[PDB]
Design a protein around this ligand. Sequence first.
Ligand SMILES: CCCCCCCC/C=C/CCCCCCCC(=O)OC[C@H](O)CO
Ligand SMILES: CCCCCCCC/C=C\CCCCCCCC(=O)OC[C@H](O)CO
Ligand SMILES: CCCCCCCC/C=C\CCCCCCCC(=O)OC[C@H](O)CO
Ligand SMILES: CCCCCCCC/C=C\CCCCCCCC(=O)OC[C@H](O)CO
Ligand SMILES: *C/C=C(C)/C=C/C=C(C)/C=C/C1=C(C)CCCC1(C)C
Length: 231
Amino acid sequence: ATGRPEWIWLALGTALMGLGTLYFLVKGMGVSDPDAKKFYAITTLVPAIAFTMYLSMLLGYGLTMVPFGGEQNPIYWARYADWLFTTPLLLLDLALLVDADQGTILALVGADGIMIGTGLVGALTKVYSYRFVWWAISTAAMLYILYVLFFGFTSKAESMRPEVASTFKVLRNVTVVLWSAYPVVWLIGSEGAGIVPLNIETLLFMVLDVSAKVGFGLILLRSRAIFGEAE
Ligand SMILES: CCCCCCCC/C=C/CCCCCCCC(=O)OC[C@H](O)CO
Ligand SMILES: CCCCCCCC/C=C\CCCCCCCC(=O)OC[C@H](O)CO
Ligand SMILES: CCCCCCCC/C=C\CCCCCCCC(=O)OC[C@H](O)CO
Ligand SMILES: CCCCCCCC/C=C\CCCCCCCC(=O)OC[C@H](O)CO
Ligand SMILES: *C/C=C(C)/C=C/C=C(C)/C=C/C1=C(C)CCCC1(C)C
């Protein structure tokens, strides 16, 4: 399984996701506040899922070959199985922080499923030019999510506890910057135009994934915003 040069970044990603999961798991022991328990559960599950899918890519299970451009291209399909479940969970963390209404949560999770689903279809599409049609639709769904996080959540966070408002603003900014890089890496990497080779593309996704999941979680789980206001 070491014949693929990208294996070193899959192994590092597996290890870092695993260590993140164990740290959040141990840190969440003894927490009794029901509000904080919700945030620990959502946030510990995110790196646990990513751990299993990085492991499946490392061992070669989460990889398939897709013919396009007259070549058999290696496509790591396990990323989308990871993102299908972990990106909604991350948006739930943000939505619960600001006490978002139920209709807005459904809009966000539904647009997020369309984003990952069409990205998977584009990844597996065999007609080269059609791959970028799905990329554009997926990116439109992303822009909807980013809009809601700015012109819907930021307006309500400012009317809540100051620790909640400040923590949301930081996590919102982290999320908007990190998530926007994903469509760019896909477009210039092996799934799209093929300008960057697969080993470098895999390194880039690994840095983004660990930052968006473990880095995100470290900021959230250290704030007092996840506990209820109590004496
Ligand atoms: C938190 C502290 C850790 C900070 C870590 C942040 C670093 C992120 C790195 C990124 C991209 C690296 C890209 C390396 C590109 C090498 C490609 C290359 O030069 O190949 C030459 C080619 O053969 C002829 O052009
Ligand atoms: C080397 C280590 C590899 C990485 C570890 C293997 C991960 C796969 C195993 C297990 C699922 C464990 C539980 C995952 C669910 C955690 C949810 C949680 O902790 O919630 C706390 C909440 O407060 C309670 O009500
Ligand atoms: C709050 C919601 C919590 C949700 C928790 C769910 C976490 C599931 C994790 C992992 C395994 C993913 C396995 C995906 C199975 C794919 C198998 C498959 O279809 O392979 C086809 C063929 O055999 C080969 O190409
Ligand atoms: C819209 C309301 C919310 C506002 C939130 C602000 C965040 C905006 C950021 C990004 C979108 C992603 C852009 C990806 C498009 C890159 C395509 C490109 O320019 O590639 C050119 C060429 O192919 C290569 O040299
Ligand atoms: C845990 C990993 C995270 C937060 C992954 C985020 C992934 C995305 C925001 C993916 C976006 C994509 C597009 C908008 C278009 C091209 C295909 C995708 C799926 C990479």
